[PDB]
Ligand binder design. Sequence first.
Ligand SMILES: Nc1ncnc2c1ncn2[C@@H]1O[C@H](COP(=O)(O)OP(=O)(O)O)[C@@H](O)[C@H]1OP(=O)(O)O
Ligand SMILES: COc1cc(Cc2cnc(N)nc2N)cc(OC)c1OC
Length: 159
Amino acid sequence: MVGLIWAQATSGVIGRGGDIPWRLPEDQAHFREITMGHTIVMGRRTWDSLPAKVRPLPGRRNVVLSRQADFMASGAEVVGSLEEALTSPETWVIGGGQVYALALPYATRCEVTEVDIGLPREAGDALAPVLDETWRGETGEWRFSRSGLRYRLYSYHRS
Ligand SMILES: Nc1ncnc2c1ncn2[C@@H]1O[C@H](COP(=O)(O)OP(=O)(O)O)[C@@H](O)[C@H]1OP(=O)(O)O
Ligand SMILES: COc1cc(Cc2cnc(N)nc2N)cc(OC)c1OC
């Protein structure tokens, strides 16, 4: 089962200056809940951006996609193609924009957080993959986070 998991603003922005452009602890909790115990796949640039004490993500099999054959990813495996990244019983692709594009055609689930923040797309932004007409499932009710930022969860699926 190949899933994608991401958080986006309503406009589709998922990154600005290499950062998620909001603060949402409750989305961090949701991300852990969906991924824990499973394989996670990320691009090398995403791995390299993480603080040393936060990688590998604990409790999950970490897979890093790279074209650098000598890359050292302490506590993870490094694969040189997407095919080899998707052989576990359940895999969550966790970023970045490049790897989400690559994996989209293979995915049969998406777990999306939509953040109700009016960030128009700007030069340099990273953008979410586009969900086409093949997907179905639940668009959850809006909730206020503890700070007052509104968010809701999509749980979509397809054959
Ligand atoms: N088909 C593929 N096979 C192998 N590695 C790939 C790949 N597509 C993407 N990548 C890797 O994933 C990196 C992209 O990571 P990312 O998706 O986290 O980045 P971005 O956040 O900038 O979209 C690529 O630069 C490449 O890693 P290297 O720079 O180390 O070579
Ligand atoms: C690459 O590692 C991480 C990536 C993210 C981005 C992310 C954040 N929120 C959601 N819903 N999905 C995502 N993929 C969130 C993370 O922790 C909350 C990660 O662990 C360090």
